[PDB]
Symmetry: D2
Subunit: 265 residues, 4 copies
């Protein structure tokens, strides 16, 4: 039988659902009355979904068995319908390294699709705020749309502002920087951070890491660290457990630093 | 001059501070009037710290320069004065994979020092709750002490309860399991999860992964995945950028699954 | 001008050549008079190759520039026209770990395409020998053909023999085992090895590693080790040096052991 | 009983042996009459070794059980009594990528302890030759001593010569370069290689990789590749198989290229 369960997860018109099938295909869709999805596994009648609930079965016209799920933020970030993102394996780590916590004031720039922005927004809680600087109007509006859909827009002030003139905010708890040329903005980042505030940026190349580190070392920053991660999945076969054949080899070099007031008395 | 800055970061008696020095030694201490720290860099008079602020310099008796910092949760987890933990590189990822978010109800068991518990507590927000089952009284009390110090105890209900009889809660959003023998508890975990709820566990060995996967595959779980990560730091020398000589080779295999109501109609 | 250079590299009818183009496509072909290759870059007239030499340019009918090269053993193993192999990243390491050297007597079983066999054959020198047991006639003949083409057949005695009855040779220097069920052959391997002789095998799964280790530990073997390697290539762009986007995540777990005469006096 | 076995492995005065104990300590020593080794496991009387053979047991004065082994080249390279080396995980791979084979003429510079030199010497066979340029007399003599002990000196011509004036040899099959500043020698390397000859170098830092790649790209070289490898060992416990806690994070970036005669007709 249909369980009432968690009421906030009740499926209604306009909700996002994730339909997951035996061959591991997944479809992220907006629920709307009288919509049909045409897939390689057959037709899915979304009207049926309104009479079901998360964790329940849905069958295609061809009898293929799928399950109705509530998408996670990761699901949304990955099924991003497509631009460049900070991937979840990195964003989660970066948010913890930045110690983002309830009530924090955080600067994020640029914003892009809002994927990293969303992670930071979850972490600041209802009482914190992300000041998200994005001079590219098209991305400001994409992020606004995504963050709204993801239930996080109330926690993010999107500012269509060029950061060359500096940030408006002072004494922010942490700052994440993701721009093509981070070395050109490190001074402004330093100025915005509280004493003991935390800085992170991502660089795609080793050349960029080198240049960014040089700039950090010119300013009052300590505890400078550079990290990369490799995540490897395994075939979930109890009798034949082994890594998958191919993996992602690289997303980004992550650089962290802590602001101090001065180098010397 | 001393900047007022972020008022909640004001240093007072009983606060935790992190003192960070040029040779990269770091000391996590409770601030108390008239306490001195004796270190290989000299004596630090903590009375001085009350007249300073985060990001400011403190000198030892031997003239060595350090900085006063507010410890992060990572700092607290790592400077754990020592038992087995889920490391931050894993806990951050696991919390994001579990989609832990504002208002979520989460089961955590066992608890240990509370390191993973803390990550989950930050993620559920002020409106969520972590039900933390820990039958070992000594660890229940350690976790209570740590979570209190870390400003998170209001979000965690520590239950000194054996999980062999099942969990009290139903329809929880996600569940994290960390026990020596996770295969013996998967049924109870399934029962506690909402439809579409998310499960994670950690296993130190490949044998344990194999056994846990077998048990998951007997129950109504889909989207089963197994992950490991390797994190590599670099020497932050702009002119000689290269990985450090030695790294951590292994913490844990991470296993995830999503609860569904049934395998077949 | 055409340089005489290394005379043994002179191109003649029946030689293998590797033609390498700007878009990184490579074509491994047998040189024969009046043959043409039809490719996505145009037609290559192999008659032209006989009037050129290694390191020289060859143009397709469409004006695309390629270079004539002598294929390496790696090139031959990879451009294997297709069955399961031990990959070069592993075979090179395994041969060094086995200390394969001039004059050594080495057992190899099974053989397959002869890829690992070839590596061992190079390592034993002109005075050593590889005893290659391959009960599958089709693979015995493939390996014979490959090893002949690769100039190594004089160093390999291919024996179409079932290893269930043991090896004919005693006191061999090293032994490489690659079969679906290595645990069923470890006793026979031990019997064939000299005192202090070296054993290696490869296993695709962690389950197989576990079973193989159990069997090794029942016999007089010491210095038991298990290795895996990850090889990551980089984009060779001086101004934008970074890892390629995707890599191989897994070939094989490698297990090594050294034979001793007995566990106790 | 004592088995005659492989006669070339007979232990005699002046031979190197490796004594391997239960706690995994290993001692590489020169066998000499009336020598005793004093270790944390007790005294080993080397006179006893002359009455034993590889794979046989030797007991210390304190009753601890060890085994007599013939050291491998890896053992010799690692138990290097200490300077900078190319590690076996890299040297084996590099020698295969360079396609070093019977009869090849190979340039190696610098030489150092001769560790990489030895790998190349094994690979060229009795009919090939390594021209090893080492202007540092102390390292020329160390390498000569090591290569002699390792049975490879007949295959290596050590030249105490500065490479700034170029190499004497032309049309060599492959060349390995290991110097602090490889970009300053790439022209001379190109000049020495045959058409289709293979080049490799190692760089400790990403900066050095960038500079070396720039220089390669100025000259007639194709198939330029950059590789790194991570090797991870496992605890060989069948019931608790998992990676060791800590591993080597970095040895060297490996760069390869193939010489062609010219960039354009
Ligand atoms: Cl993003
Ligand atoms: Cl924990
Ligand atoms: Cl093979
Ligand atoms: Cl070396």
């Amino acid at each position: 039988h249909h369980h009432v369960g968690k009421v906030a997860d009740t499926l209604k018109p306009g909700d996002r659902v994730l339909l997951s099938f035996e061959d591991e295909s997944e479809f992220l869709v907006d629920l709307e009355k009288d919509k049909k999805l045409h897939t390689h596994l057959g037709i899915i009648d979304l009207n049926e979904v309104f009479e079901k609930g998360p964790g329940e079965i849905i069958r295609t016209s061809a009898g293929k068995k799928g399950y109705i799920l509530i998408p996670s933020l990761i699901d949304e970030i990955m099924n991003m319908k497509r631009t460049q993102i900070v991937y979840p394996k990195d964003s989660s780590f970066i948010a913890m390294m930045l110690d983002v916590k309830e009530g924090d004031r955080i600067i994020d720039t640029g914003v892009g699709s809002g994927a990293m922005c969303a992670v930071l927004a979850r972490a600041v809680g209802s009482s914190g705020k992300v000041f998200a600087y994005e001079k590219r109007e098209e991305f400001a509006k994409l992020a606004e749309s995504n963050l709204t859909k993801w239930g996080l827009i109330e926690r993010v002030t999107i500012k269509v502002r060029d950061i060359s003139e500096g940030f408006d905010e002072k004494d922010v708890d942490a700052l994440f920087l993701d721009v093509p040329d981070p070395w050109n903005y490190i001074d402004k980042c330093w100025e915005a951070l509280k004493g003991g505030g935390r800085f992170a940026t991502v660089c795609p190349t080793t050349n960029q890491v080198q240049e960014t580190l040089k700039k950090l070392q010119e300013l009052p920053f300590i505890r400078i660290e550079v990290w990369e991660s490799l995540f490897r999945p395994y075939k979930p076969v109890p009798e034949r457990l082994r890594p998958v054949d191919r993996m992602v080899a690289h997303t980004a070099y992550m650089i962290f630093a802590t602001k101090v007031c001065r180098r010397e008395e």
